[PDB]
């Protein structure tokens, strides 16, 4: 019973520290008009370190993980949705990018910045649109952190894309319903030197929203019985 | 020179009878007011027969090829983002689903369409998509046709979802480029005697852009190296 599937999203739910939320429900700081004015204020670009919280919602973050884990030891890489309220950036949904591989990036700087906002800006423009506030990619097994790849890439994303985040996960190891491994993080401009590195860690929320849970539900359970194929990890 | 992705490119698009164009221009026989009039007008389900017609984007088709191929002998599955232009349905682009593949599917009737409306009405309550003319799925070797889950899950999506088509595809002798296998299908009632099985084909055709050159290209790519990867026909 504690073996089954609710349970064990029940537990990983408390690993992760989540709330249960309404999307506001406390979610949001602030009210619609004065998220507007910031929106329209654009608080960066004058304060590097404006953006001090990022919250993802456990949909995004599951999609995420089971993407991370299918693809294996390989890094995979996708892209995340989302709608930025005051210094708190919040991810309500993520996907996979349709194409896989380290040559849209060590084979030239912009490569993967350049495929990002192509496939974002056909994206939108055309079906289904979207708000991009991020890109997220895995480094299974060697945790969460910023190469210089990524630090390349995430400062065309913070020139362009802006407001943009990038998130790294590290699904390897991690029990069963446990502690997922993520860092989300922000460049700063060529120049910065607030000197008391090129990049910083903004600090990670999850919670789930009303909606989210049918589909949580599905997705959830997908994620569980395909842990229970490979096994003797939960002993 | 043919040896390489360009060329291939050029053998399939040729081969797949693939017509250019841009946006707005030469697919469509409509300008948005009648569009919408028609839109209103609901003229399904006067005519079961309506829509005789489905054109794909090139990027859609070689997005659903390379997810059906990827897939190996696993069936798959995604979703489809398009418009009704009169009795076309017109398919911008196309995405994979997390695929069960199997257990979503054949231990009740309605879980398969549960699944992908869930998914569906997540991402439009956000804002977002607004967009889905259907669903695509494989069956790798044995050809495209409706296989009567196939059958009950797309009578649910027309009756609710109803302006959707189901597209099937075949991911076998890619024989570098090649003709596709696919088909667009619409079932009926069952509360009718078609005038003479429970669905029908409709006429695909497929059609190329501008802007989408980069990203085709790029798909193509990566597409074209996974086929040099095996090849005892490539001699
Ligand atoms: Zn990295
Ligand atoms: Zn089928």
Redesign the pocket.
Known sequence: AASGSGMAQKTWELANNMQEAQSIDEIYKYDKKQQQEILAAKPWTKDHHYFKYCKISALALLKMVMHARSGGNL?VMGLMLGKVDGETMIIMDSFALPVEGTETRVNAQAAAYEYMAAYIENAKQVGRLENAIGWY?S?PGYGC???G??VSTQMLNQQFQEPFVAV?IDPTRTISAGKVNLGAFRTYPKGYKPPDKQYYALEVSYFKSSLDRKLLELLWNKYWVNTLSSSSLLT
């Open positions: 890094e990619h480094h952190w910023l190469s790849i990524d790294v």
